[PDB]
Amino acid sequence: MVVKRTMTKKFLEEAFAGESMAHMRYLIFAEKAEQEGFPNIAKLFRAIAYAEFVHAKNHFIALGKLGKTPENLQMGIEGETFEVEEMYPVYNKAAEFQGEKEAVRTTHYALEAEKIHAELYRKAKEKAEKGEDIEIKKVYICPICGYTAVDEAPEYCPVCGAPKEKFVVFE
Amino acid sequence: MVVKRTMTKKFLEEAFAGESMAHMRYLIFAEKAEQEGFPNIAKLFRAIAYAEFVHAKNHFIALGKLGKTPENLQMGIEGETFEVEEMYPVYNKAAEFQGEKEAVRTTHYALEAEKIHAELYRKAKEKAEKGEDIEIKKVYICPICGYTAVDEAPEYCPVCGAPKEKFVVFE
Amino acid sequence: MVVKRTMTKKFLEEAFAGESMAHMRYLIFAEKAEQEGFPNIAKLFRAIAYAEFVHAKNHFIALGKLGKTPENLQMGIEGETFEVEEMYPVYNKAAEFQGEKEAVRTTHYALEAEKIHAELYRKAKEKAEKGEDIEIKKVYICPICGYTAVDEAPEYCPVCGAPKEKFVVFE
Amino acid sequence: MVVKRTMTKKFLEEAFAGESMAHMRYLIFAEKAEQEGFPNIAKLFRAIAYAEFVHAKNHFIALGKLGKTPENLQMGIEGETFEVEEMYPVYNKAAEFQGEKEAVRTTHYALEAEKIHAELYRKAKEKAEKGEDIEIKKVYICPICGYTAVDEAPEYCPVCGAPKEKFVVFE
Ligand SMILES: [Fe+3]
Ligand SMILES: [Fe+3]
Ligand SMILES: [Fe+3]
Ligand SMILES: [Fe+3]
Ligand SMILES: [Fe+3]
Ligand SMILES: [Fe+3]
Ligand SMILES: [Fe+3]
Ligand SMILES: [Fe+3]
Ligand SMILES: [Fe+3]
Ligand SMILES: [Fe+3]
Numbered sequence: 055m056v057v058k059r060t061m062t063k064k065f066l067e068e069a070f071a072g073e074s075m076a077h078m079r080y081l082i083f084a085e086k087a088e089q090e091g092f093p094n095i096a097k098l099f100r101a102i103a104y105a106e107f108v109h110a111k112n113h114f115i116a117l118g119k120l121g122k123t124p125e126n127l128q129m130g131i132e133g134e135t136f137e138v139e140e141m142y143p144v145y146n147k148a149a150e151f152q153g154e155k156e157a158v159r160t161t162h163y164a165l166e167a168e169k170i171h172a173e174l175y176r177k178a179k180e181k182a183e184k185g186e187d188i189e190i191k192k193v194y195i196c197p198i199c200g201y202t203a204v205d206e207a208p209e210y211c212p213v214c215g216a217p218k219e220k221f222v223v224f225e
Numbered sequence: 226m227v228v229k230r231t232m233t234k235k236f237l238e239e240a241f242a243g244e245s246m247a248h249m250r251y252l253i254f255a256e257k258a259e260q261e262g263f264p265n266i267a268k269l270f271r272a273i274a275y276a277e278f279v280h281a282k283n284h285f286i287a288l289g290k291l292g293k294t295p296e297n298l299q300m301g302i303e304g305e306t307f308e309v310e311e312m313y314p315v316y317n318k319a320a321e322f323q324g325e326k327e328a329v330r331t332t333h334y335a336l337e338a339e340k341i342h343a344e345l346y347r348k349a350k351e352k353a354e355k356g357e358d359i360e361i362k363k364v365y366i367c368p369i370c371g372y373t374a375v376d377e378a379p380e381y382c383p384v385c386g387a388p389k390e391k392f393v394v395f396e
Numbered sequence: 397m398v399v400k401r402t403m404t405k406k407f408l409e410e411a412f413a414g415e416s417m418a419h420m421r422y423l424i425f426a427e428k429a430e431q432e433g434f435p436n437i438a439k440l441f442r443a444i445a446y447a448e449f450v451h452a453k454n455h456f457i458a459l460g461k462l463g464k465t466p467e468n469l470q471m472g473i474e475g476e477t478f479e480v481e482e483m484y485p486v487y488n489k490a491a492e493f494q495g496e497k498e499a500v501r502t503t504h505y506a507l508e509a510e511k512i513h514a515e516l517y518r519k520a521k522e523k524a525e526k527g528e529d530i531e532i533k534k535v536y537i538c539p540i541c542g543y544t545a546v547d548e549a550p551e552y553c554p555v556c557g558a559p560k561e562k563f564v565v566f567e
Numbered sequence: 568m569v570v571k572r573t574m575t576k577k578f579l580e581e582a583f584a585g586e587s588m589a590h591m592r593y594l595i596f597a598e599k600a601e602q603e604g605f606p607n608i609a610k611l612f613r614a615i616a617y618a619e620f621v622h623a624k625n626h627f628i629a630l631g632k633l634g635k636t637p638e639n640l641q642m643g644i645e646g647e648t649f650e651v652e653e654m655y656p657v658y659n660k661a662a663e664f665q666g667e668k669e670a671v672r673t674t675h676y677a678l679e680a681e682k683i684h685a686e687l688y689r690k691a692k693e694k695a696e697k698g699e700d701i702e703i704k705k706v707y708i709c710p711i712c713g714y715t716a717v718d719e720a721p722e723y724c725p726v727c728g729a730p731k732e733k734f735v736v737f738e
Binding site: 055057059069070071074076077079081085087091094097098100101105107108109111112113114116123129130141142148149152156157160161163171178193196197199202222224 | 226229232240244246247253254256261265275276281282291293300304316323327328332334335339353372
């Protein structure tokens with residue numbers, strides 16, 4: 055059963071946030087580990103990242119935030135709406151005011167790529183509240199700007215300008 | 226250049242935290258979607274999670290926290306030590322005092338399964354600054370509690386008693 | 397009109413928190429300043445603390461949480477209930493587990509003296525929704541572990557045992 | 568002895584923040600209460616606010632953040648520098664971007680009056696490390712924009728435009 059007392063709820067939320075941070079950091083370290091002359095350290099990094107994922111999933115289930123697929127899609131829709139309507143524009147404008155190139159560039163990349171996720175989730179929710187699965191194949195993702203390309207893949211990136219060969223395929 | 230202003234650094238740290246949380250949530254959503262008759266929505270969730278990973282990696286690179294393997298290995302060691310020694314016993318004590326079965330069980334699993342990551346990382350560091358690669362193969366991870374079993378794997382999980390075949394191998 | 401946007405609401409809440417912390421810090425600084433040989437620096441600290449109070453009051457008015465007293469007492473009642481019931485026992489248990497004399501002593505002084513505020517506020521609210529002011533006089537307070545003594549004053553503080561002459565009277 | 572373990576430090580810092588918030592809220596409620604037909608409610612509000620101040624002071628001393636006046640003034644100097652350089656300009660620009668009148672007005676009042684506090688603290692500090700007290704009298708504070716006037720007080724407020732009769736005297 056979901057926890058009700060406030061303090062244990064706060065503690066579990068903080069634990070989930072920490073475990074997610076740890077898993078993401080380990081994933082980031084693994085890429086550089088495999089990019090250097092130590093191919094077998096990325097194995098350990100990915101295994102322990104999976105362990106942190108398991109811990110975070112256990113914490114998430116403990117709070118009882120998981121339901122059916124339509125509710126998960128609704129939560130994703132709300133999260134995506136908050137990430138490209140309120141947070142990122144303000145962060146980009148603050149970074150412009152303070153005058154630093156890297157933060158402005160990163161938020162520029164992240165600001166223009168999040169507008170599609172909400173549409174995809176809404177389509178999935180409209181097609182999932184009845185008993186049927188959507189049709190999709192060979193989703194392309196950029197490794198430099200995170201740009202969701204569905205089915206067809208543009209020859210060059212309309213955000214950074216990377217060639218189509220550089221993309222990663224999820225099928 | 227690395228971000229030196231305080232407000233932009235705080236903004237980017239919060240954005241990194243949000244992206245990591247979103248990526249973890251999307252991975253959990255995909256895991257749930259595989260369990261129902263929607264194999265394609267799991268693909269969509271995985272692709273969007275990889276996009277969130279790219280966003281968070283760009284945010285992490287902007288802050289300049291990434292370097293060579295010894296430094297991020299030491300960072301992982303510090304994080305694991307902090308997680309095992311201080312936070313988890315306190316959370317377990319608080320959950321025991323308030324009296325939630327789920328929080329106590331999850332914290333018990335976490336504090337009993339997280340003890341080996343620090344030792345593994347500590348050993349690995351003193352070989353990744355001289356120039357060689359670690360000799361570890363075929364790592365095992367439990368899918369319920371998450372206990373890193375290196376090379377050989379026990380017949381049953383000492384923490385939860387899961388069968389051997391349930392283990393997720395990495396090689 | 398009240399502030400409706402989420403991001404700027406969060407910004408104003410954080411600013412209010414910072415102003416309150418600064419005002420508390422200045423009020424604490426003034427007491428030590430007057431304890432030494434500088435009676436004018438205490439005056440400067442008091443004036444600057446009042447300026448911070450004005451800032452925080454403006455921030456509070458902007459967010460729109462201040463209104464008529466009959467409904468205003470409810471926020472204080474809820475805050476006192478949360479402080480006495482949930483937050484403080486957990487902190488006391490954690491400080492006992494980690495083993496710090498100062499934290500345990502401070503929490504023990506805290507939870508045992510915060511119990512009367514909720515009762516006083518409930519009585520004030522249920523006597524003050526008809527247009528009449530409550531009949532109360534000479535509220536006493538201990539200067540070490542403040543225990544809200546109403547009207548009459550005990551000879552010694554039941555919590556710390558301080559003499560009666562040290563009580564700070566309000567009239 | 569100062570608290571050294573991390574979790575107790577976090578808990579005590581959160582408690583201090585909560586107590587400061589409670590004190591400020593109670594002060595504002597008292598000021599509203601005395602503005603209407605109930606005079607004696609403000610007495611109770613101010614008494615319990617003093618109790619919250621005592622609790623916050625105990626928590627602050629527990630973390631051992633208090634020293635002599637020379638070093639005490641440094642914390643105020645740094646706080647004012649951060650408040651007037653980083654936080655308020657960014658908050659004002661964000662409020663301008665989102666387009667709300669109240670937040671822009673409050674931040675405009677706040678950012679134009681905090682520049683003199685750092686100078687006052689520095690002037691007090693240079694005279695404090697030698698062993699003597701500064702000379703100051705009749706400090707005026709505006710009650711609708713927080714504006715520190717030293718000795719002489721202008722006829723009209725150069726920020727809001729209030730007459731010099733409305734000010735409050737801190738002697
Ligand atoms: Fe963990
Ligand atoms: Fe996103
Ligand atoms: Fe791209
Ligand atoms: Fe297990
Ligand atoms: Fe301020
Ligand atoms: Fe209280
Ligand atoms: Fe007492
Ligand atoms: Fe209180
Ligand atoms: Fe200030
Ligand atoms: Fe003014």
